[PDB]
Every structure is written in C-alpha cells, then in structure tokens.
Design a protein around this nucleic acid. Structure first.
Lengths: 80, 89, 122, 81
RNA sequence: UAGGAGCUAGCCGUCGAAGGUGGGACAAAUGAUUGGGGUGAAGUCGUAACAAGGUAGCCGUAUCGGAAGGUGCGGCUGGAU
RNA sequence: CGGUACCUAAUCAGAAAGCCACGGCUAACUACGUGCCAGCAGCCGCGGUAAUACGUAGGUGGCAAGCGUUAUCCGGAAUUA
RNA sequence: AUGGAGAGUUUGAUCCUGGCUCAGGAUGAACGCUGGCGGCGUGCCUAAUACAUGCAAGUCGAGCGAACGGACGAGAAGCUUGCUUCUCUGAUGUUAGCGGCGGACGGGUGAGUAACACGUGGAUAACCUACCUAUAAGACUGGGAUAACUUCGGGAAACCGGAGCUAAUACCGGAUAAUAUUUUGAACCGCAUGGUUCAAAAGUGAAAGACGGUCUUGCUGUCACUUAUAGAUGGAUCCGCGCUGCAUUAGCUAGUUGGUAAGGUAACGGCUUACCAAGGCAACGAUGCAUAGCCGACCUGAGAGGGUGAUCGGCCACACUGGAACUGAGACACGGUCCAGACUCCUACGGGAGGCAGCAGUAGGGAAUCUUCCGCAAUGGGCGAAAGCCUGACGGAGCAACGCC
RNA sequence: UAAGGAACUCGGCAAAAUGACCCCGUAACUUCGGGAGAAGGGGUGCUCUUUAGGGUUAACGCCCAGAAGAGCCGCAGUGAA
C-alpha cells in the first residue's frame, strides 16, 4: 500500500543529504488530564536536498535506506 | 500440520472439550488458530456435538487435516458427510 | 637440587601458588632435595578461596625439578621449572587436580594418588 | 545417558557434511577460479558461465544454497555477461 | 608424475575468548586502639535558662573557658523603665 | 483411576471441636495467693497485704476445626491532599 | 457516581497542628495448641547451590544390504522311528548398519535483560518458510562405493588404531521446459522505485519400493520424488506511544556523526572496509550508575486507580562456564560436535567418562513448601497406511486444614 | 660458572643488575614550584619500493628519513665501548 506519511519542519540538514525535521504534539498526564506539549524528531532522508530552512516538510516513512534514513520526502512548502 | 484437536475444560475427572483447529507444534492447551465448536462425549447419553462446519470447508481444503479421533466424529455426526459433497467439487 | 630458601611453584589446586622451603627432611645435615623427596615449606602466595592459606607451614613432595634425575639405564630427564605438591602426611594430596607432567620415580615412594591424577607421568 | 540417536547423528552428519563439503567446497572452488577466470575477457569470456551458471544452480537444485543466493550469483555473473 | 590451478598439509600477518600479571579504581568485611552520639542509672557537682529567675533576650560573628558560660561588634523584639 | 466413588440393609444416640480476655475502649466476674514481686501490656495502664488487670479456678462471650501469635500489601486516611 | 463513619494520643483545663497507634480485610504464609469426613485448588518464595541412582525422543522390511536365529519341503536315516545332523524353499523377528524424518516438540527456569524486551497501533515498494492442502511441470541416464564379512593390533578395561570386501527409494556425473536470470520497450507512488505482460544467451529435476488387479504393469493408489504458483505456519526486519530511580551522575559519542564505493542479508545500511566536515548526542538529564524478564492477569480501591505474578495464560532469555562452527527448512542445538576453563567420577595407571533449571529422589541452606508413586485408559504429539514404541506430556493416586464449600 | 638466590654478614660490604636515543604512560603528598627520568610499558639491523618529509630541495636524486608498506638474516640489531 502506502507507508506512514507524517509531517514535520527542519532543524538541521546534516552534511550530504540528511535533513532532520521536527515533529511535536500534545500528550497528557492521565492522572491529571492536563495535556502538555512534547516533541519527537523523526529524521527523514532528503533525496536531492529538496527541503530548506523554515519548510514545514511533510515526509513519508520507508524501510531503512541507512542507519537513520527511515523516512523519505514528498512535500515541501516554503523557505525563510 | 495445522489440525483439529480436543482442548478440554471442566473440574476434577470431568472434561469439557471445545474443539480447536491449530498447529501440531503448539501444546494441547496452547495458543490456537480457530475454536470452532465443542464436544462433550462424556455424558450419560449424548456426545453434545455442537459444530459450525462452515470453516471446515476452508481449512481442510488448504492445509488442515483431521487426525484419527477428530476425523471420525465428523464421519459420525456427519460434519465431513456434508464435506463429502464439498470435497466432491 | 632444592635446598633451603628456594621457591617452588605449586602444581596442584590446593590454593597455594608459591612455596618457600624451610627444611629438607631426611638426615642430619642433608643439604639438597630432588624429585621424590618430601620438604617442609611455607606458602608465600595463595589463591583466594582455597584450602591452604598464606603463612601456613605445610609439607610437600617434589615433582619436576630443573636439574632432574638420572635413571638406571643412563637416561636422564630434566624439566623447565621446579614444582611441588602439598601432601597430607599419609602421601595423599591436599588438592584434587595436578597440573603438568610428573616424573616416573614418584611411584617408588608410593605416591600413587599423585601419579594417578597427573596428566601423563613421564 | 546419551541415546543412540546422538551417537548416530554425529557420524551421519560427519558423512553428510562430507557430502556437504563435497559440493559446497567444490562450489567454493568454483567461486575461487571460475569467478577469477570469467573476468578480464579471457578465452572463454562468454562461455565460462556454462560451467558457472551450471554449478551455482547445481547448488540450487539441491539444498546446498539459497535460490536468492543463486540469484545473487547471476547478479554479478551476468552483469559481466 | 600428480608438476601447475585449486585442495589436505605448509608457512605468513589481522582480529580473538579466557588467561597471565600489571597498575590502579570501586565495593564489602575485619582490625590492637580510638571519639562523637543514643538509652539507662541520672551515682556525682553546679544551678546556667523559665519569675526584670538575683547580672533581659536572639541571630550572624569572634574570642576565651573543660563545660556552663565570658566578652565584643552590626542587626532584630520574640523585653522591663 | 476402581470395585474406589454410589446404592442397600444391619449398627449404638455410637468414637469428635478448641482458644483469648472478662479493667475503658469491648458484649463475656468473681474468690485464693500476690505485695510494683511473679508477671500481663494494642493506647490509657494493673500489682506497694482488701488486683475485677498478674498467677491460680466456675460462669459466660465472640465462633467454630479452629483459636492465637508473628511478619507482609490495602482500606480505614484527602500524613502526597 | 451502590462508596467515603473510625478508637486514642501533647493539660491543671481547652482549640488547632502533627505524626504515631489499633479496630477491618487479605497471605504460596509460617509457628504454638487443636483436630470428623468428603467435594475442591495450590503446592523450595531461600542456593541459576551441588548431585548417586532410576529415567525421561523416538520412528519405520511396505527402503536394501546384510548377517544371526529360525518356522518352512527338508533326503538318506544319526536306525537311539526321531529328529531337520545336510541341502535349498527360507517367512517373520533379531539385529546392527547404511536411509529418510525427528532433534528447535512436549518439559523446566527467570540469571541476564530498564530494553522494541514486552504490551499495543501500524508497515515491508526489505521478507522467508521443510512438512500440510490445492494448483501445473513430470519422473530419461549411467553409477562407484559403502558399513555389514574377512584380517592385524591394543587394552580387565571402556572403545579404538589398520588391510581387503557389500545393497539401496542412500549417493554422484550427462541433456530436458519453467514469473529463475541480466540485456532490449509499453504500468504509478514511496524520490529511489513498482506493475505484468513483454523477449532473449540461458537454467535441471528425477525414487524407486510393498502391492488391489492388471499387462511378468498402470494411472504409479500408497509415499514420495523435483519444477512454477498459491493457501498456511511461525519467525524476521522498521516507526508510533505505555514502560524504575540517582545531577551527592552534565557535557556524551570519534566508524561515532551524515554522505561516498565493495560486500550480503529473505533485505537494509557506519555493519566493516578506503574518502570527506567535525559533526552528531545532549539539563526535555544524552552519558553512566543501581535495580528488575515484560504484558495479560491478580488484588483492593467511590471513581480518579495503582501495588502481586506462587498463580494461570501469551511473548522474551537460559540450559557447568565462555567461545567457534556444523547439520538441518528451522540451532549457533536442555539427554549434538570442537576449543578453552573450572569441578566431579572410574581405573588393571593404559586413558576413559560427566553436566538433574526434563520427573521423583539426595544433601545443603531455610521457618517451610509433595511419593527414589501408578497407568498411558482418555487426550495430545512424534515417525510409520495401519498396527506398534515413546510419553517422568498427560490422566490419576499419595501427603499437607495451607486454603475454599 | 650447574642448581639454588642474601640462606652470607654487625650490615647485601663487595660485585652483579640499571644505563644512550625515540614513543606511550605516570601515584600519594605538596609551600602549587615540585614529587618526576616516579613507578611502569614498548621500539632500534639490512635491502627494496614511496606517497613524502628535515628537505640537499633544484626533487624524488644529496644524506638523514616523513614515516608507511613489502621483504632478508642472525642465538642476539644503541650487536663493541
């Protein structure tokens, strides 16, 4: 079928085609019910250095092309 | 292979089998594939055969085998007797 | 040719490693011991755990000397190090295993238990 | 108290591995030389594979090797061919 | 011939568990003796604090005195005239 | 498993409950020693020659093949609110 | 929202605040004393301490050599008129091999593991799969050995060292077709890439038995056999989150951190190797320490829930220790191999052996936790058509008020 | 100078052992200088490649090497002092 197609926004493109987008959302204490923001970066493989600084990058997961490269690029919107 | 068996219940010296078609590599009370029906032959009269024979049409046609005591209540109650025409396809 | 003050490595598992010899048993004035003789000795280096402890005064039998023995047919056998085995004053060992080869003349002093346990008697 | 299967298996797997080191070593003979002789555009620059693709499927026609390894063999063999 | 190619064998260097010590590090146990603490008996001496408890306290600090306390300098009342 | 279970008959009213207090908590008390002694002791506490509290013995009481002690998690407890 | 009161306790006497204490439940409980019977569960919690013995995985003459015994016609009679003393018809069984399967199952344990391990939700355009079931390709060729038998030796030993021999559905060489395969073009999502026809050098099977009756065999039924799909099994790989505490652990890493090329895996890459920048990881506490298999489940809580795991199930890890491999579809294998180590045992002293965390039993420690028990009748599994064996799985008996009626 | 290694002796007296250069590493304690060359480890000949240092640089050639690979010899490579 497909694979998982989560979104993000870059933090640091590593040298030679490794961008690192940032995902963050809101989990709760189930004892309290109060949700709180929390982050979890999922590092995507950029195929051709497509994404830029400021880009709210939507990515898509793959099977590992390398040690960290679990996600591949579909959508990039803007740049600063 | 995957096969129908006799997985029991009940208190001391009194079994309550609910049948299970699953692999022979599992133990006799292990994790299963499908709990089809029950069979309590230990009564005063009846064998209490409850059977949903709709899924024997699947599994006996692509890998499950009846094995030497679960085979011949199907030849007794008539579960495989309906399969006799269903194997005649 | 083991005399007073020499150090012998211990060839069993009784917990001693090094031993210093105090006397050569025998007669008055007997100066040197060789393969098959019984010496009395101190343990200068022990293995943790172990039956015999540092500072103990034991007796041992000499297997293996560096200047070994002459036999009756004029053949000789020498070894590369001096070793001993701590005994139980009935010529039984205190350990349970023997490491290394052991001279044949140990059978003449009736140390049969040592001779049996050893890897090949030479 | 080891049963007679354990004393029987060690000798039949002595001789079955002697049949396994018969052909796999002969295949690892073949990947030492027929690999080294198909290259550099030799005399049999395109006919050496008629023993190579013969024997690496002789390992595949029995339980000697995985078929994808035989597929892995033709990957680097027929790229040269 | 079994010479090449390979193979058994032969050497030749990379990595190895364990070992061997080697230094330490860390942890635990023990150690002739010791010194702070707790409990009891408070055996004993003194009466400091509570009555402006016979010559108000309290903190930071500093010094002496075995200790209690003694004094001194800033600050506080949680004190009499 | 097992002639075990079960059914018939015969049988004697047959052969079988134990334990802690009897102070206030808490329903179950009174005499002998006893003299802060023996000792009990969940908190408060009893005994110094008139103890209901100790120890000795009849009643009962709580409830049954258990009763009591010991240690261990939770409620009682909103001392993690 | 079926629950949520408590009893005391600072005085000469009150209010607050405070901890502390008991009343109430449960325990794999155990102990002092007691003890009717059944119907029921649970049963070393400590030493993953060490082990004597029994003893626990086998399988098939319907594979085919053997060889043995041997019924089997079994002479002349050995004249003791009864056996076979001979021959061959010699079955079946024994052997003990060669052979295919199994050994990774059933069983036991929680040391390691604070982690993708487990739980739970996804994913593979990186997935494998003997046997089983269905699907089609079909079963041509030659074949040495080779244990067994003879022969030499060791040792009480154990079990070996050498010389010549033997069958196969065992085994190995010759060509046969397949979505094999890398060379040429037309599918869409996940950049890479896929998708199902394409069209081509290719690629090689192969097993024959006891037999129904026929044809002195044929579809090979049986039961396989090897070629291209599937169904299944269990396992693999990859991201979500739930997952102990210490900063009296703050700076963590340097094949590390990304990429660049070879491997190779069922596939992936820093996984390793030659290259490039110091990068990447971090106080949101990386790092390290200490502790602990995980979950379901238990349990009591009004709910907010969180503590147990003997239980009873599902998954992971382990099999004297520590390494390396083989074989097998599946192992780095609990009653396989080798190495190294530590312990233990037999000896005729020459060298031989063993790994109870499979079920009882023994010692130990402990406060304490089952009989060196029975039977496979049921079930369930193993190889065999079946019959048969193995069940120390299981089904029962023992023993215990330890607990429930 | 076999084996042994302070058993000698008032006493390890005398002798033996250590030693150059290069590379790795190094404690307690301190007056913060040190301790320190702590201790403790490893290396060293010759030939050929070479990519390249001090460069002899003109450049490898001219010697030591930049120091890396591959070799050869001996019981031993600062082979003596």
């Amino acid at each position: 079928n497909d694979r998982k197609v989560y979104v993000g926004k870059v933090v640091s493109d590593k040298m030679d085609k490794t961008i690192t987008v940032l995902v963050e959302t809101y989990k709760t204490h189930k004892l309290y019910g109060k949700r709180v923001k929390y982050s979890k970066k999922y590092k995507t493989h950029d195929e051709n250095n497509s994404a830029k600084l400021g880009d709210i990058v939507k990515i898509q997961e793959t099977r590992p092309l390398s040690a960290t490269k679990r996600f591949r690029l579909v959508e990039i919107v803007e740049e600063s | 292979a995957v096969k129908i068996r006799l997985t029991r219940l009940g208190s001391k010296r009194n079994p309550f089998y609910r049948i299970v078609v699953a692999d022979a590599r599992s133990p006799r009370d292990g994790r299963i594939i499908e709990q089809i029906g029950t069979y309590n032959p230990t009564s005063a009269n009846a064998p209490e055969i409850k059977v949903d024979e709709a899924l024997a049409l699947k599994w006996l046609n692509d890998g499950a085998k009846p094995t030497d005591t679960v085979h011949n209540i199907l030849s007794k109650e008539g579960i495989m007797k309906k399969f006799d025409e269903q194997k005649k396809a | 040719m083991i005399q007073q003050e020499t150090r012998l490595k211990v060839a069993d598992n009784s917990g001693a490693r090094e031993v210093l010899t105090i006397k050569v048993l025998g007669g008055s004035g007997r100066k040197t011991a060789n393969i098959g003789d019984v010496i009395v000795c101190t343990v200068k280096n022990a293995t943790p755990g172990g039956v015999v402890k540092k500072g103990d005064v034991v007796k041992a039998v000499i297997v293996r000397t560096k200047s070994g023995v002459r036999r009756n047919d004029g053949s000789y056998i020498k070894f590369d190090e001096n070793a001993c085995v701590i005994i139980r004053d009935d010529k039984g060992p205190r350990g349970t295993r023997i490491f290394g080869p052991v001279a044949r003349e140990l059978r003449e002093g009736n140390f049969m238990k040592i001779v049996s346990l050893a890897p090949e008697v030479l | 108290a080891n049963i007679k299967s354990a004393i029987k298996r060690v000798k039949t797997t002595e001789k079955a591995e002697a049949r396994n080191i018969s052909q796999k070593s002969a295949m690892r003979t073949a990947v030492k030389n027929a690999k080294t002789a198909v290259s550099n555009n030799a005399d049999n620059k395109n006919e050496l594979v008629s023993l190579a693709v013969k024997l690496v499927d002789k390992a595949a026609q029995s339980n000697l090797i995985h078929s994808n390894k035989a597929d892995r063999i033709k990957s680097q063999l027929m790229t040269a061919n």
